[PDB]
Amino acid sequence: CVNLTTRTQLPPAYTNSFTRGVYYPDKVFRSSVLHSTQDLFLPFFSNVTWFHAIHVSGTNGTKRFDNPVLPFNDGVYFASTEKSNIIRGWIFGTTLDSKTQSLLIVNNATNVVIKVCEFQFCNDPFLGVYYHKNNKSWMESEFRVYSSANNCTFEYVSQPFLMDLEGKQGNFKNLREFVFKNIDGYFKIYSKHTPINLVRDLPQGFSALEPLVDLPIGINITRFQTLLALHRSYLTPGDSSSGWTAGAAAYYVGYLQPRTFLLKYNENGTITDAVDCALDPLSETK
């Protein structure tokens, strides 16, 4: 896991975020109103990074891009799109060296599991297991380059929310908007699976988020990351099968900068139009 410090090159790209990232503030029902409130959000048009690290079998000559450091910054955005369900969990914390509890997520397989263990680093004890059609349960082998820790607390298991929907050779179908928020009451999570036909262009349609889970924790988070580097080993070096080869990840991200929004619930109970206040003088007037 972590990385093989293969920091070949870092091209920073900036993209204009269109109308995106509107979520339900509180679990109260309303309909056909124009209630306005202030809360943690991200601006309607804010430049965000486009971390072009999707090296599905390399970009050009196994041109793989790493993602070692990513600071939390009081709240985080996330998005990605890919046919292969290579996306696997997120990591949060400040030091990530058995000094602060780190949020580790394992998806797919049997069921999604979330842990806040105080482990030293990514253990990867069984992250490569019974994959493809090896169809033999040796269980003797283990992931090589790094060891495993033991300290753990607050194990949580549920149905895998990292849903691949229908993984098929379609035009473009998968867009996950896993939004993570940190407050004292509980670490809050939102998601929205949307099919969009553009891969480079972030969709301009107006979708909304829905709450997922209410896990109570009050630990400090300063940096985030995601490790798709499980099964990165070639299995047998002659075999040369790391899934397909190595991995790939989009992890299109951004930061919040809270503000005051005006949300208009529709007749049925969903969000049809939201408007900012400080975006422009016209926004202030609205």
């Epitope: 493809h132 993984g167 099968s241």
Partner: antibody, heavy 124, light 107 residues
């Protein structure tokens, strides 16, 4: 030892509907693990995949032929069928039926068992 | 559609030599490459579903390597029974498209 055996007419007049059927043995087609496909190969030419159908009923075809081809499944009798309309001189080929198997954790896709094929000729 | 181009369309070789055939896809297909065998007068038979492993009943002499868009299939020691046509096939695009084929002959 699942084997697939084909029943066809062998000959179809021009501008008539070709009907083929592939009988699956060694197991029921109602298993959700397989995709059942028709493929064809013209005499002396390469292989061209025609289409698949998932066991649930969902079907997919090569776009160049989507309008004229129809693949159906009958799990209650463990066969699946092909109907190709507006047969032309290029429709003469050997037609194979085959099972595809795939996993979700790793979306690799491959044809692990094939049928024997059936020669379709389009002549008056 | 995705176009697949193999370096040899036909070849003649002798018993015991190592033969290598390449396949190149029009754009990056990761490792979504399958290998088929067409015996004279026989039905198509899957040989290499994934380069890493060999399908049941496939002779051990068949192996695969390569990356990105270019992939290699090797037979470490050709035998007379290996006379056949080998096709590579991507499944990155929606159609399960196949290559043009490489006829491997035995001297």
């Amino acid at each position: 030892q699942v084997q697939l055996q084909q029943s066809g007419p062998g000959l179809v007049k021009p501008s008539q509907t070709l009907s083929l059927t592939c009988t699956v043995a060694g197991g029921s087609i109602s298993s959700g693990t397989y995709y059942w496909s028709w493929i064809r190969q013209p005499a002396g030419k390469g292989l061209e995949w025609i289409g698949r159908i998932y066991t649930s009923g969902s079907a997919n075809y090569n776009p160049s032929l989507k309008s004229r081809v129809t693949i159906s499944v009958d799990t209650s009798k463990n066969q699946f069928s092909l109907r190709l309309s507006s047969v032309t001189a290029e429709d003469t080929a050997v037609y194979y039926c085959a099972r595809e198997y795939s996993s979700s954790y790793y979306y690799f896709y491959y044809m692990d068992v094939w049928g024997k094929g059936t020669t379709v000729t389009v002549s008056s | 559609a995705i176009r697949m181009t193999q370096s040899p369309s036909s070849l003649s070789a002798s018993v015991g030599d190592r033969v290598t055939i390449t396949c190149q896809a029009s754009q990056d297909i990761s490792n979504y490459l399958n290998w088929y065998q067409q015996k004279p007068g026989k039905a198509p038979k899957l040989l290499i579903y994934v380069a890493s492993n060999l399908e049941t009943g496939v002779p051990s002499r068949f192996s695969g390597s390569g990356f990105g868009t270019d992939f290699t299939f090797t037979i470490s020691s050709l035998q007379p029974e290996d006379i056949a046509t080998y096709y590579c096939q991507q499944f990155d695009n929606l159609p399960y498209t196949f290559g043009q084929g490489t006829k491997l002959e035995i001297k």
